[PDB]
Amino acid sequence: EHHGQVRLGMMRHLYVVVDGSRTMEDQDLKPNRLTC
Amino acid sequence: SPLDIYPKILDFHPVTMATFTMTLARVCLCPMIIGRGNDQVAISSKFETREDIAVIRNYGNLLLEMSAVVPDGIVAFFTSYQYMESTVASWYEQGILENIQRNKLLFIETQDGAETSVALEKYQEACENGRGAILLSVARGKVSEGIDFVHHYGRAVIMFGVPYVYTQSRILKARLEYLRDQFQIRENDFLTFDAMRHAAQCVGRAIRGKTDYGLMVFADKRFARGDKRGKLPRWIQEHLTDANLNLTVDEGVQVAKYFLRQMAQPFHREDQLGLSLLSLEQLESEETLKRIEQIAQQL
Amino acid sequence: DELNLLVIVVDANPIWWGKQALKESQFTLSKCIDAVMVLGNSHLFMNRSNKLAVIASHIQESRFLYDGKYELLTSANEVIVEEIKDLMTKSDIKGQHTETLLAGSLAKALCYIHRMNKEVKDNQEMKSRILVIKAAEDSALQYMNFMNVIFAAQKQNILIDACVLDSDSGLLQQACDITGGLYLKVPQMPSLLQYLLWVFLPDQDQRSQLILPPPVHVDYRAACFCHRNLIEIGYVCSVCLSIFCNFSPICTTCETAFKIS
Amino acid sequence: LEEKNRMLQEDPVLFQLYKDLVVSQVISAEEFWANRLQDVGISAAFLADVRPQTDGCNGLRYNLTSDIIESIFRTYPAVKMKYAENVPHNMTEKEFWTRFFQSHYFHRDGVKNPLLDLTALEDKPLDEGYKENSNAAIIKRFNHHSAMVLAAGLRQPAVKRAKLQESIEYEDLGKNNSVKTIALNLKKSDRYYHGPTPIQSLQYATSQDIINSFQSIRQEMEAYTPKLTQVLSSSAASSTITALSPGGALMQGGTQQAINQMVPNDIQSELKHLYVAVGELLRHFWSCFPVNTPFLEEKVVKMKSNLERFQVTKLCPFQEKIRRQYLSTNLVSHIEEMLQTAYNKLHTWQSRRLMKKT
Amino acid sequence: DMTCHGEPSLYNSLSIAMQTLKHMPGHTSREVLIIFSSLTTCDPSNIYDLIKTLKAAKIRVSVIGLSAEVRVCTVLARETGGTYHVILDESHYKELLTHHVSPPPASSSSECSLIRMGFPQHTIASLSDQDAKPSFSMAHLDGNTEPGLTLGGYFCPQCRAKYCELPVECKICGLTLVSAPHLARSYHHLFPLDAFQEIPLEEYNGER
Numbered sequence A: 001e002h003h004g005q006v007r008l009g010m011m012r013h014l015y016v017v018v019d020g021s022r023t024m025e026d027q028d029l030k031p032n033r034l035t036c
Numbered sequence B: 001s002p003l004d005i006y007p008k009i010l011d012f013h014p015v016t017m018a019t020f021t022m023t024l025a026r027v028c029l030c031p032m033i034i035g036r037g038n039d040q041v042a043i044s045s046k047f048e049t050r051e052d053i054a055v056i057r058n059y060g061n062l063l064l065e066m067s068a069v070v071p072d073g074i075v076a077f078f079t080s081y082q083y084m085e086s087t088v089a090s091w092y093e094q095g096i097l098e099n100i101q102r103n104k105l106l107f108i109e110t111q112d113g114a115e116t117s118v119a120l121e122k123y124q125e126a127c128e129n130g131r132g133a134i135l136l137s138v139a140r141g142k143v144s145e146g147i148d149f150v151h152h153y154g155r156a157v158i159m160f161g162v163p164y165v166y167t168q169s170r171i172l173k174a175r176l177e178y179l180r181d182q183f184q185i186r187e188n189d190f191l192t193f194d195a196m197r198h199a200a201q202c203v204g205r206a207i208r209g210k211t212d213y214g215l216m217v218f219a220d221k222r223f224a225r226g227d228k229r230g231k232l233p234r235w236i237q238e239h240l241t242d243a244n245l246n247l248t249v250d251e252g253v254q255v256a257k258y259f260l261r262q263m264a265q266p267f268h269r270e271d272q273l274g275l276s277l278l279s280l281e282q283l284e285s286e287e288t289l290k291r292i293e294q295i296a297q298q299l
Numbered sequence C: 001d002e003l004n005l006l007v008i009v010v011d012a013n014p015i016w017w018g019k020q021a022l023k024e025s026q027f028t029l030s031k032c033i034d035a036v037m038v039l040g041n042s043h044l045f046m047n048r049s050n051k052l053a054v055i056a057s058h059i060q061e062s063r064f065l066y067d068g069k070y071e072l073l074t075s076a077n078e079v080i081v082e083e084i085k086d087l088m089t090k091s092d093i094k095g096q097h098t099e100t101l102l103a104g105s106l107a108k109a110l111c112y113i114h115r116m117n118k119e120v121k122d123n124q125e126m127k128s129r130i131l132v133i134k135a136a137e138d139s140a141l142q143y144m145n146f147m148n149v150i151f152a153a154q155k156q157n158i159l160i161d162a163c164v165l166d167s168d169s170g171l172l173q174q175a176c177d178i179t180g181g182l183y184l185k186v187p188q189m190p191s192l193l194q195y196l197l198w199v200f201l202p203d204q205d206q207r208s209q210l211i212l213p214p215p216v217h218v219d220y221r222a223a224c225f226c227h228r229n230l231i232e233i234g235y236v237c238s239v240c241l242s243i244f245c246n247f248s249p250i251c252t253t254c255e256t257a258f259k260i261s
Numbered sequence D: 001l002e003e004k005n006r007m008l009q010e011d012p013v014l015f016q017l018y019k020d021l022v023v024s025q026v027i028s029a030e031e032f033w034a035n036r037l038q039d040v041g042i043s044a045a046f047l048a049d050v051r052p053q054t055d056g057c058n059g060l061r062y063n064l065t066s067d068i069i070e071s072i073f074r075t076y077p078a079v080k081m082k083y084a085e086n087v088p089h090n091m092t093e094k095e096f097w098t099r100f101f102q103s104h105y106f107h108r109d110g111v112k113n114p115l116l117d118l119t120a121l122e123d124k125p126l127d128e129g130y131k132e133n134s135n136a137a138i139i140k141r142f143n144h145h146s147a148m149v150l151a152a153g154l155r156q157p158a159v160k161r162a163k164l165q166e167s168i169e170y171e172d173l174g175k176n177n178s179v180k181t182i183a184l185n186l187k188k189s190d191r192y193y194h195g196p197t198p199i200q201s202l203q204y205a206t207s208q209d210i211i212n213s214f215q216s217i218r219q220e221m222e223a224y225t226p227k228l229t230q231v232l233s234s235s236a237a238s239s240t241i242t243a244l245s246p247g248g249a250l251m252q253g254g255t256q257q258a259i260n261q262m263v264p265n266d267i268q269s270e271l272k273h274l275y276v277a278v279g280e281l282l283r284h285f286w287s288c289f290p291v292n293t294p295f296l297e298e299k300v301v302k303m304k305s306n307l308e309r310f311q312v313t314k315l316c317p318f319q320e321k322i323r324r325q326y327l328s329t330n331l332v333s334h335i336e337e338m339l340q341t342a343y344n345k346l347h348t349w350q351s352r353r354l355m356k357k358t
Numbered sequence E: 001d002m003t004c005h006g007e008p009s010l011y012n013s014l015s016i017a018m019q020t021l022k023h024m025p026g027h028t029s030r031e032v033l034i035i036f037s038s039l040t041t042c043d044p045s046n047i048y049d050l051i052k053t054l055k056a057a058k059i060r061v062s063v064i065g066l067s068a069e070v071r072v073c074t075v076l077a078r079e080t081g082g083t084y085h086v087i088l089d090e091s092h093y094k095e096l097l098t099h100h101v102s103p104p105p106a107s108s109s110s111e112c113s114l115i116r117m118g119f120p121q122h123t124i125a126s127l128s129d130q131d132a133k134p135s136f137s138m139a140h141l142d143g144n145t146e147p148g149l150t151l152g153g154y155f156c157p158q159c160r161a162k163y164c165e166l167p168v169e170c171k172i173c174g175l176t177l178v179s180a181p182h183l184a185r186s187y188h189h190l191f192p193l194d195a196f197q198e199i200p201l202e203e204y205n206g207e208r
C-alpha cells in the first residue's frame, strides 16, 4: 500500500520485544506461538 | 419485544406501534446460547437445578475459559444474590475461581452501595489499565439499572439463565392473578416476558455505536424455547444465528475467538457509506428513501 | 532434479562491432555468435535437465533469440541465427542513443528466469545463472536501474558472470562481487570460446572443486554530486541521501534545508 | 572501592587493563572511571500459585524468596506490620509463616461521578415505606485483595464534564485527519541515475563515418554463415591454457605464508589487549571531538597525554619483545598508524583553533 | 528453545528500550515493535507516565497482537504514532511483518541533518607486498574464538580501525562505514513503482 511521495525512515533503530509468557505455548499458530 | 403487552399493561391504544430494525454493515454483536457444558450437562437456572453442583462447575469452567480467551471487559449477570453468592463460594471451594483470578482480576458486588461503587471504579480502572477485570452482578441489581458499558467495557456480557423473579412474593402472585382476571394474560407468559426484558436490559447496554462491538452469552438451555427466545429484541433476536443455538463451552469459545478476530481488524467509516451510513447525497437518493421506509415495521 | 539454466546476454551494439570490423581484427561479431552458440550447445550437452536461454542486447530493443549434428542443437542454432539476422538486418540507427540497453536485457532475463521457475515443478530445483559478454562501452544513466537488477538477482540468489571483451565496466565488477558471479576480461578475443568453456561453463558446484583465477579487486569509491570527484568521507543527506564534500545548509537535490541549529 | 574491586574482578581483562592503565600512571582511577560510569509488578497469582512445597519425605520446603515476601508486603501491608511486630524477638520467621498457613488468613476457603455514585443515581431516596456470612466475608476479602493489587500497581465539575465528553463522543461522527506525513519532492532526479559513480570518459564516436561503420557491419553480418574451425585453434588453445596454467597472469599471486606460526599466541593476546585499550582511548577521544566547548580542549589534551603514556609504557616494551624475536609482522605498524592519525588530528584542530583566534 | 513462563511486562521492556534509545541522534528514527501474546501485563509503576516520556522522546511504538484488541496497546500505538494490528493467521502475520519491514513515513518533528559518513574500500594486503601487516578485526576481536587475523580488509578512513564486515558503524570514531550499493539499495523506496492498469484480455485490444 504505497502512500504519497513522502519522507521515510532513512535511518532506523528498531527494537523488537517479544512476549515470553505462559500463553506463548498456545496453538493459535502451529505448532505454537513461540516457534512460528 | 412485545408491542401489544404495553397497550395492555398501560391500558391504552397507542397511535403508532413501529419497530425500527437495526441495519449493520459490520456485525458488532455475537449472541450465543450455551445450554450444554463440557460434560454435556443440561444447563439450566431453575431453582430446583440452581443448587446443582454440576451447573455451578460448568459455569465456573465457562467463566474460566472466557477469561482466558475474551478480553478484559467481562460482566456476569446472575438470577439472585443468594444464588450468586453460593456459586462464588462453591467456585472458591472447588478452586476454579482461583484460576480465574490468576487470569483476570475479579470484582464482586454486594448489597452495600459504597462497596459496589468502589468495585465499579476498580473494574473500570483495571479495564483501562490493561488488566482483565470481571464483574459479577444480578439482573435486578443497580448495575443493570443505570450503568452503561463502552466498547472497551462491554466486551463480554454473560447472562446465567433466564432471570425469573422468585415467585414467593405473593405481591407478584397477586399481580399475576389480577392481570389474568383483567387482561387475559397468563402468569407464566408475564414471567417469561419480565425475565426476557431484564435479560435484554442487562445485555442491551454493551453497544454504543457501529464501531462498538461486544459479545453476548446466554448460559442456559431454556433460552432455546421459542416462547422464551421469541421474547428477545428484534435487533438482537434477528442476529441470533440458529447455528449458535445450544452450543457448548468449547464451541462458544471458538465462536468468540472468531468473532473477536474478525471485529478487531481495522475498519474504515467510508465502507459504511451507502450501506449503513448515509451522507448528504446518499440520503437524497430515492432508492435509499424507499429502503429506509422498508426498514421500519408497524404492528 | 538439478536444472541448470545459463541465460546468455550478448552485447550486440552495432557501433562497437562496426568499429572492430573497420579495424579488420581477427575477431568479429560472427565469431562471437559462433562462440555463444557453441557454449550453449555444450551447456545443453552436459545434462538433459539443463536449459538454455539466449537474449541479444541491442540499442533498439532486447531480442529473445531463444546433417551430422544433434537435432535439437541444429534447430536451436537455426532459430538463433534467424533471429539475430532478422534483428541486425532491420537494425536501423534512428537516434543518437549509442549505449546499449544492458539493464533492460538483464531485467528481461530475470523475468524469463522467474517464469521458468514458476513453470518448474516442485519435484526439481532450477539453479539459474547468467553470463554476460561486454564488448561496447558501459552506460551511465542505466546505473541506478542496473543496481535495481543486481540486488534482484541477489534476491533470488542468481550468479551473474561478466565477460569483458574490450571496455571494462566497474558496474559489472561490483555486480559479480555482490552476486558471486565470475568477472574476467578476455585477453585474446579469438580465444574467447575456451575462456567461456574453461571458466564460465562449469557450474558453481563444479567451480567449487575446480581451481579458478582469483576474483579481481573491486573498488567502491563515490562521486561528490557538486563535482562528482572521488571522495573518502563525505556528508550524507538524511533526506535524499545526496553526498557532498563540504557542509551545506540546504541540499541541492532534495531542496530541504538541513535544520542544524 | 569494594564494589569497584568486585566489578573489576568480574572482568579480569578489564582488571588487567585497569592495572596497566593506573599502576603504570598512564591514567588516574578518577579519569579511568570517569567514562566507565529492575522492578517487578504485582501479580494477583502470588497466593494461589505459591504453595508450601510438600516433598514426599515429609519435607516442608517453604522456598522462602525475597520477591515473594515483598509481593506479600505490597499486597498486604498488614503482613508487613505482623513481621515487624514479631521477629526476631516475639517469634521466628518460619514459625510465623507456619502460623499464617494454619490461620484462616491463608485458608480463607468514587472519583468519577456519573457511572459510580450508585447512592446518588436515584433522585427518590425515601424511607422503607414505599453460609451467607462466609460468602460475604469471602467476597469482601477478595475485593479487598483486588483493590490492594490495583493500588500497588501504581506504586470537580471539570472532571465530570470531561468524563461525559469522553462517554458521549462517537468516533464515527468526528474527525479522521491522520495526515501526519511530510511529502518529499527532490529537485534534480538525475543525480541518482549516475550516482556515486565518478565521471567516466564516455567518448562519442565520430561524424557520419560512425553511420558508415554501422552500415558496413550491418552488411557484413547480414550475409553470415556459421563457422567451426575458425572458432578456435590449438595455438590459441595453448595460449589460453598458459594463461590459465598455475602461475599464469590470470592466476594472480599464488601460495602464501602461515601468519599464525609467525607470531606467538601470547604476543597475539597482548596485541588484542593493546588494540582494545587504544581503541577505547581513541573512542573517548572521538567522543570528545569535535571540541565545541572549552572544557573539551583540556579533556582531549589529557586524552593525548594518556595515549602517549600508554604507548611509551606498553608498546615500546611490546616493540622490544617483538624485536627480540625479530618477528617480521608489522603488527605495531597498525597501532602506530592509529596513534599518529589521532595525534595529527589533534594537532590540526589546535592549528585551526589558533587560526580562528588570530 | 526458550522457557515460556510468567507474564509480559510492558513497563520494564519499554523502559529498557527507551534507556537504550535515549542517547540516539535526532535524525535517526526511533521505532519499537512489540509482539503481544498475553492480554495481561504487570506494571511495577504507572504506564502512562512512561507513554508521556516516550512521546517526549519521539520514540515510535508499533504493536502486533495475537489474541484480540487491548485498550492499553491501542492507546500506546495511537498516541506514539505507531500502528496496532491483530493476527488472523500465519499469512496475516507475514503480511504485517512485511508491512513493518518498509520504512515508516517520517514525522513532521523529525530532523534533517547532514550526517557525515566514510566509504572505505576493501583494502586487501598481499604478502607479495612488504606492507602486508595483519591486524585483528574490531568486530572479530570481541569474540570468544580467535579473531580474524587477516592481512587486509576494510580500514576506517577516520581512525584506521579495521573491520572485516560491512556495513558496520565504526566503534571508535562513530563513523558510519557503508558502501555505495547500500545507499542505492533503498532507492526503490525513494522511487516506488506505481501499480499497473489491470485490463481484461477481451477488452485489451492490443498485443497478446
Ligand SMILES: [Zn+2]
Pocket: C237, C238, C239, C240, C241, C242, C251, C252, C253, C254, C255, C256
Ligand atoms: Zn537532500
Ligand SMILES: [Zn+2]
Pocket: E156, E157, E158, E159, E160, E161, E170, E171, E172, E173, E174, E175
Ligand atoms: Zn573509525
